Design a protein around this nucleic acid. Structure first.
Ligand SMILES: [Mn+2]
Ligand SMILES: [Mn+2]
Ligand SMILES: [Mn+2]
Ligand SMILES: [Mn+2]
Ligand code: NA
Length: 347
DNA sequence: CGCTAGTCGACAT
DNA sequence: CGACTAGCG
């Protein structure tokens, strides 16, 4: 996420209802509904007991969107991203820790805290996601497993005109360059839409409302790919970019002390890390549903050389990418767990 | 005022 | 994979 981004650009938001997008296509960051639905049956999942509450939970939202005349395209997280593997190790070990801690707190008699500790152990498997996938295919709803992060895939689907809005709880989508993002949507359709064009309404941003500058700001504040410098948040980063009349961000990051009046030392790790983060936001591998090909989020600029972008996602053969995207190929074992075919029945 | 970092809701009975 | 809020620059 970009910590505190929503309240920072709150002036560009607008309370709406999804009825607004009737007769149009909307992509969904399904992990949110998956997580929320998985909260309801934390004990069943932790113990390993069979359950399918989260499926119906997601299907409520899906059927709702279908009822209001929307065509939803559920998008799911795929393979792990190397840039994001630190946090994905942290969350893992913490999940295990709270799992065992809850298992022990079950024996104290404090069942009230064992379940709260089971809440911090929710691990959304790809099998659950695939249950949701078949459940969605039942009502003739298209699904798409991102080659890596769902964020990038959604961003592409939005910037390519395939969808007109994105349903998520994550503010990362704005940093990826989404035109329209619908946050905090309930089971009835009440949501909070953030439009990119309205970023100019935010006084705090100043002239930092262009996609590139906005990206730089979000990265400088601290993201999932690169932790920020101690004492650097959204406001100070935005201040840096505002006071900086320089197309070359590197020298600016170097003169961050001159811009912020703070004696800040910039390590050599942070420059490379910044270029890493920017290249991750720009050229993370997504999946084209039309041409059925593995492509970066944005077209490669002459500035960067793709050979040094393994962290932004590794390429594979397009057929395998297709079988992953359909959910037919297991993300982990790479073995065929299903055989759905859109040919013999978005693409 | 701005930022870090820890707490605790989210679902829902 | 988030919204607050105290505690500190
Ligand atoms: Mn995030
Ligand atoms: Mn995501
Ligand atoms: Mn994200
Ligand atoms: Mn400027
Ligand atoms: Na920060």
């Amino acid at each position: 996420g970009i910590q505190g981004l929503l309240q920072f650009i709150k002036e560009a938001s607008e309370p709406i209802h999804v009825r607004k997008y009737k007769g149009q296509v909307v992509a969904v960051d399904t992990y949110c509904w998956l997580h929320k639905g998985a909260i309801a049956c934390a004990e069943k999942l932790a113990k390993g007991e069979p359950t399918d509450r989260y499926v119906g939970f997601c299907m409520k939202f899906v059927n709702m969107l279908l009822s209001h005349g929307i065509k939803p395209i559920l998008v799911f997280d795929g393979c792990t991203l190397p840039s994001k593997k630190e946090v994905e190790r942290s969350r893992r070990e913490r999940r295990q820790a709270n799992l065992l801690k809850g298992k022990q707190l079950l024996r104290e008699g404090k069942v009230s805290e064992a379940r709260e500790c089971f809440t911090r152990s929710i691990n959304i498997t790809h099998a659950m996601a695939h249950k949701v996938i078949k459940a969605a295919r039942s009502q003739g709803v298209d699904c798409l497993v991102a080659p890596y992060e769902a964020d990038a895939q959604l961003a592409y689907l939005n910037k390519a005109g395939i969808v007109q809005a994105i349903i998520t709880e994550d503010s990362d989508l704005l940093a990826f360059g989404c035109k329209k993002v619908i946050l905090k949507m309930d089971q009835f359709g009440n949501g909070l839409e953030i439009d990119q064009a309205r970023l100019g309404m935010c006084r705090q941003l100043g002239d930092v409302f262009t996609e590139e500058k906005f990206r730089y700001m979000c990265i400088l504040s601290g993201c999932d790919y690169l932790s920020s410098l101690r004492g650097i948040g959204l406001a100070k980063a935005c201040k840096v970019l505002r006071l900086a009349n320089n197309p070359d961000i590197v020298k600016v990051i170097k003169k961050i002390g001159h811009y912020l009046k703070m004696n800040i030392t910039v390590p050599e790790d942070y420059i490379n890390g910044f270029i890493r983060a920017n290249n991750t936001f720009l050229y993370q591998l997504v999946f084209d549903p039309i041409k059925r090909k593995l492509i970066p989020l944005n077209a490669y600029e002459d500035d960067v050389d793709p050979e040094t972008l393994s962290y932004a996602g590794q390429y594979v053969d397009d057929s395998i990418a297709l079988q992953i995207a359909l959910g037919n190929k297991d993300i982990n074992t790479f073995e065929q767990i299903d055989d759905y075919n859109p040919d013999t029945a978005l693409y």
